[PDB]
Design an enzyme around this catalytic site. Structure first.
Site, PDB file in Angstrom:
ATOM      1  N   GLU A   1       0.981  -1.445   0.243  1.00 28.86           N
ATOM      2  CA  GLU A   1      -0.263  -0.202   0.387  1.00 28.86           C
ATOM      3  C   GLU A   1       1.022   1.024   0.070  1.00 28.86           C
ATOM      4  O   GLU A   1       1.601   1.500   0.272  1.00 28.86           O
ATOM      5  CB  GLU A   1      -0.746  -0.420   1.245  1.00 28.86           C
ATOM      6  CG  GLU A   1      -1.919   1.299   1.192  1.00 28.86           C
ATOM      7  CD  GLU A   1      -3.227   1.213   2.418  1.00 28.86           C
ATOM      8  OE1 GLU A   1      -3.622   0.165   3.200  1.00 28.86           O
ATOM      9  OE2 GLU A   1      -3.787   1.989   2.613  1.00 28.86           O
TER      10      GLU A   1
ATOM     11  N   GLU B   1      -2.778  10.878   2.397  1.00 31.02           N
ATOM     12  CA  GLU B   1      -4.218  11.021   3.649  1.00 31.02           C
ATOM     13  C   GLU B   1      -4.607  12.132   4.463  1.00 31.02           C
ATOM     14  O   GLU B   1      -3.376  12.386   4.821  1.00 31.02           O
ATOM     15  CB  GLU B   1      -3.860   9.431   4.606  1.00 31.02           C
ATOM     16  CG  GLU B   1      -4.844   9.969   6.512  1.00 31.02           C
ATOM     17  CD  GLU B   1      -3.782   9.240   7.065  1.00 31.02           C
ATOM     18  OE1 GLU B   1      -4.036   8.114   6.592  1.00 31.02           O
ATOM     19  OE2 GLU B   1      -3.137   9.402   7.717  1.00 31.02           O
TER      20      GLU B   1
END
Ligand SMILES: [Ca+2]
Ligand SMILES: [Cs+]
EC number: 3.2.1.73
Length: 241
Positions: A54, A58
């Site tokens: 991943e 964010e």
């Protein structure tokens, strides 16, 4: 399936290995909220073997003037991370910005409005094995310690995605000898279910259920909604880019 709020998770139906990913968007922000643009190997989360793969961007609603970069490798229960913080101006919820992720076998690179804010070479990059899909989500976490008190008077919240471009990794080929060549562009005049999927699920730690009602095309922009259940439809005018 029974929470009072609904959120969103958009994901490419297909995953790829290496490439460049760009999304032109204006984020939602409020104490308690979380939204990210991220590369993700589906199934990375299943405790049964397989490495975790991943790469994140964010934005925590409590501080929209900043965002976090991260690489998660390893495997659930032994994952290696690399959280870094970056400033965004104007704040991610006050203007549209072009967020970019680049992934090759040698480096991962983060960009905003075509400007670099981080490049990781070697190390964790080597363990970003296999494929990853491109995802975007908008939700609220129960961990107030991490996201802040959940400011419910702020709902409904909307994130707007004007367009997404996905490029293939073509070492040397591409403009000015760059490493990527445009593959496809989505301007979001419609939700193209042949290219994208919408999540319908939730988890312990998520105050909301991610549902297919929270994603929809409006006026040439894709909308991701964070609202009380049943109130997912935006009223008002789509912000101009
Ligand atoms: Ca558009
Ligand atoms: Cs409100």
């Amino acid at each position: 399936s029974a929470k009072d709020f609904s959120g969103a998770e958009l994901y490419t139906l297909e995953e790829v290995q290496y490439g460049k990913f760009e999304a032109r968007m204006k984020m939602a922000a409020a104490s308690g909220t979380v939204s990210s643009m991220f590369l993700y190997q589906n199934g990375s989360e299943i405790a049964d073997g397989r490495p975790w793969v991943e790469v994140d961007i964010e934005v925590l609603g409590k501080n929209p003037g900043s965002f976090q970069s991260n690489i998660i490798t390893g495997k659930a229960g032994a994952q290696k991370t690399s959280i870094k913080h970056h400033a965004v101006s104007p704040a991610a919820d006050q203007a549209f910005h072009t967020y970019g992720l680049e992934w090759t076998p040698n480096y991962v690179r983060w960009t905003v409005d075509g400007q670099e804010v981080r490049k990781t070479e070697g190390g964790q990059v080597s363990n970003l094995t296999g494929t990853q899909g491109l995802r975007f989500n908008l939700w609220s976490s129960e961990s107030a310690a991490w996201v802040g008190q959940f400011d419910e008077s702020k709902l409904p919240l909307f994130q707007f995605i004007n367009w997404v471009k996905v490029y293939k990794y073509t070492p040397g080929q591409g403009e000015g000898g760059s490493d990527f060549t445009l593959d496809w562009t989505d301007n979001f005049d419609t939700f193209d279910g042949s290219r994208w999927g919408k999540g319908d699920w939730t988890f312990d730690g998520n105050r909301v259920d991610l549902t297919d009602k929270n994603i929809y095309s409006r006026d040439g922009m894709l909308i991701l909604a964070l609202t009380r259940k049943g109130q997912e439809s935006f009223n008002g005018q789509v912000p101009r880019d």
